[PDB]
């Protein structure tokens with residue numbers, strides 16, 4: 001009947017509980033993954049059966065409100081969510097993805113497709129805040145969960161919804177994609193902090209697609225051409241090989257490889 005579900009709560013959340021959570025999310029994302037090379041490759045969307053296409057992340061907080069994000073296993077990204085008897089989806093990019101999401105939350109009474117996609121450029125626009133001025137941590141996540149829930153009752157305004165997506169996507173999807181970003185979150189939880197992401201986190205997130213390409217197209221682990229990233233202080237540097245990123249990137253979107 002149902003896609004795999006991972007549960008997380010911000011209520012009493014620890015370094016350990018967040019760690020177990022991201023571990024479980026990666027576990028479900030990589031059931032069908034190619035794990036025979038240096039970095040796990042998520043399943044190819046082409047030909048992937050619909051019953052293997054999604055996982056669900058059920059989030060709860062101190063207020064014991066609950067929402068369920070749907071993640072696409074082919075890119076680890078949030079495609080939509082359920083709150084109560086309503087489901088809300090980002091605008092799909094093509095007809096195959098639109099058809100795919102009709103298989104999610106099939107029991108809800110109310111289904112809605114937003115006009116907008118879930119990319120950061122658009123979400124930041126809707127939120128009126130760049131990622132660099134949106135705080136991440138257990139506090140922001142707790143508040144994002146309530147805001148997501150109350151969207152369904154008319155009690156959350158759309159800019160707050162968008163900000164809340166930005167928080168959730170980074171703390172769940174990007175943390176699953178990158179050990180580096182998981183560590184950034186882990187440190188926030190460890191010292192009970194909330195703070196916006198530094199440029200290293202932001203450019204990793206921006207570069208995930210291109211890194212996945214450069215890695216899977218590489219020859220003897222060597223990139224066809226460098227990819228520029230940023231340190232935490234904003235300074236730039238280049239990456240030329242796959243091995244140096246094994247500790248940094250945990251998962252990759254399927255990419256084809258050269259002749």
Ligand SMILES: O=C(O)c1ccc(-c2ccccc2)s1
Pocket residue numbers: 180200204229230231232233248
């Ligand atoms: O001192 C620093 O801030 C850093 C050193 C290396 C960093 C990094 C960032 C993204 C990917 C791989 C390494 S950040």
